[PDB]
């Protein structure tokens, strides 16, 4: 009668359908622990994420709703693919946990970052990453949380983006970015509390690319004031026109910082960190550097877009319209707009999403 068995994985208990066998842990984050499993019906490995009592408070609820809604919309080879959504509880009153089942990838990007990548692999991985982002951007979705723990790869050299809990739909209203633990990849506009467009995500690609080359985090900060200082030290105090856009108190503190000059991008990414220079006229160290100097730009109105990035010669060698000009996700009549509902109401919203589609 009972279609669920309950595995123990350290602290947390997974109660999952019988079809998913031999669960084992593969990763973790703010939302708990992720397991690999064998799906006896599809006869392949999958990934299984558990959201426990996500309706328990505001920030967990908004994050879960966004995840469910957007996992159902996305459809692209470089976005993690949704496979199943279920909950073991049988009614709304009893509802506790949501389980998301996804295709299984071999590792997240933190593993790749320590090793030395040649130019072919470095540019191909970024291209795939940019294609994933363009797909989100082609329906107005801004991810806001790109970072290496949110990108996964397979040993066949494919790459997929995941974790849309912070993703935002389109709108002309300011939305404060939710708190997160790993903040090293946030763009200046997010740090400083300014309005922002989709190429906040491009700044994050900039940090990731710098890391794949440095094998070290570009802007490590205990604090936000710490983090801003790392940015200006390395890139330089921004132009006075960029200072006007700031609110007064944020403005006074940023203008009172010591005026750093910033280093060149040759001084920031010398040939030594880059592999042997290809004979291919586009996969140069000088081209990867050029692309970095256009992504790692403090003032977003001066910063390259995802589309221009895909046309850049370091990336452009792999260009295929079936990947970079693919059909968008279909964003339903639901606003992921950081509104507030109460505990009782979030519970219904999240339950309906699990049971409907």
């Amino acid at each position: 009668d009972n279609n669920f068995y309950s595995v123990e994985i350290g602290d947390s208990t997974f109660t999952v359908l019988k079809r998913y066998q031999n669960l084992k842990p593969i990763g973790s984050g703010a939302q708990g622990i992720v397991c690999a499993a064998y799906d006896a019906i599809l006869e392949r490995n999958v990934a299984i994420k558990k959201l426990s009592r996500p309706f328990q408070n505001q920030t967990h609820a908004k994050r879960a709703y966004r995840e469910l809604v957007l996992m159902k919309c996305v459809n692209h080879k470089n976005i993690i693919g949704l496979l199943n959504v279920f909950t073991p509880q049988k009614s709304l009153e009893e509802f506790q946990d949501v389980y998301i089942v996804m295709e299984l990838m071999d590792a997240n990007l933190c593993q790749v970052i320590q090793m030395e990548l040649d130019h072919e692999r470095m540019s191909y991985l970024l291209y795939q990453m940019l294609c994933g982002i363009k797909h989100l951007h082609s329906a107005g979705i801004i991810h806001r949380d790109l970072k290496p723990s949110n990108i996964v790869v397979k040993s066949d050299c494919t790459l997929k983006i995941l974790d849309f809990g912070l993703a935002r739909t389109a709108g002309t209203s300011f939305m404060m970015t939710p708190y997160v633990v790993t903040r090293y990849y946030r763009a200046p506009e997010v740090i400083l509390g300014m309005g922002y467009k989709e190429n906040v995500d491009l700044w994050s690609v900039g940090c990731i690319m710098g890391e794949m080359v440095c094998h070290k985090i570009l802007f490590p900060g205990r604090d936000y004031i710490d983090q801003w200082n790392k940015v200006i030290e390395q890139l330089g105090t921004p132009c006075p026109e960029f200072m006007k856009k700031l609110q007064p108190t944020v403005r006074t503190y940023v203008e009172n910082r010591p005026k750093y000059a910033g280093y060149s991008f040759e001084k920031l990414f010398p040939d030594v960190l880059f592999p042997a220079d290809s004979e291919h006229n586009k996969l140069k160290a000088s081209q990867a550097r050029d692309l970095l100097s256009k992504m790692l730009v403090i003032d977003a109105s001066k910063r390259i877009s995802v589309d221009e990035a895909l046309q850049h010669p370091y990336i452009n060698v792999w260009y295929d319209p079936s990947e970079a000009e693919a059909p968008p996700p279909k964003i339903p009549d639901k606003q992921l707009d950081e509104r507030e509902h109460t505990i009782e109401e979030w519970k219904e919203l999240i339950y309906k999403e699990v049971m409907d589609l």
Partner: peptide
């Protein structure tokens, strides 16, 4: 046009939202 890579080795061989809540 160069062939896309098909293999990638994964193992080596060798409280506060913005900078305004702190001030």
């Amino acid at each position: 046009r160069p062939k896309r890579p098909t293999t990638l080795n994964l193992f080596p061989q060798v409280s506060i939202c913005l900078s305004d809540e702190l001030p």
